[model samples]
Target: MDETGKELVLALYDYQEKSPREVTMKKGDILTLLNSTNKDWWKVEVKITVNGKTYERQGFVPAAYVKKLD
Candidate 1:
């Protein structure tokens, strides 16, 4: 869980950003759900690691493409 107690989710399908406002995610990526105010699009955070450094990006993703974790 995150600082706000938001649930972590797993990407169920590979989603490429169709617009600048959307986030790109691959299947099996772990993400943090930020906001779900919209039914079709949810704000999420994606963390990617490279060279032992983790970088994070925040943007909208299709709500149906991710599954909430317990």
Candidate 2:
């Protein structure tokens, strides 16, 4: 079984569409996995850090673009 608080890191840039649910990230951005039950799309919050501060953006991205953190 999967853990309750699972997270995934962005492995590649996933520019799916122009919609708000589409997630845009760099090569090594971190994300919080919101849905583990979903098959194709992963609802997540992109973790963006700047100047020692951090921010999060909620969106949906392709599952293949993210990698599971062991």
Candidate 3:
């Protein structure tokens, strides 16, 4: 979580393949931070809305996609 602990924010890639280690994110989807331990990648989650419903997905996003919240 971020220092504020209110929410974690990140960017999502358009995606290549939905591999187990990697998931798909929208071209400019805003995501919330979940966990980040590796320097090369950060574990993140996103809420996607579809068919008038929403779901949560978790996966490792490349560190470059992450942005500083504050």
Largest lDDT belongs to which candidate?
Answer: 1
lDDT of each: 0.80, 0.65, 0.62
For candidate 1, what is the TM-score? Answer: 0.72
Worst 10 residues of 3 by lDDT: 1-10
> Candidate 2's residue-wise lDDT over 13-68, tens digit each?
54554687666755576667777667677777765578987766677777776676
What is the TM-score (0 to 1) of candidate 2? 0.59
Tens-digit lDDT track for model 3 on 2-59?
A: 2436556545445443577565655576656677677666677766679978777777
List, in order, the clash count of every candidate structure. Answer: 0, 0, 1
Clashing pairs in 2: none
Model 3 score (lDDT): 0.62
TM-score of each predicted structure versus truth: 0.72, 0.59, 0.62
Winner on lDDT between 2 and 3 is 2
Residues 1-70, candidate 1: write the lDDT tens digits: 2355567878899989988767898789877887778878889887668899887777899878888777
Off by over 4 Å in 1: 1-5, 48-54
Supply the global lDDT for candidate 2: 0.65
lDDT over C-alpha atoms for residue 48 of model 2: 58
Clashes of 2: 0
* Candidate 2 minimal-lDDT segment of 10 residues: 1-10
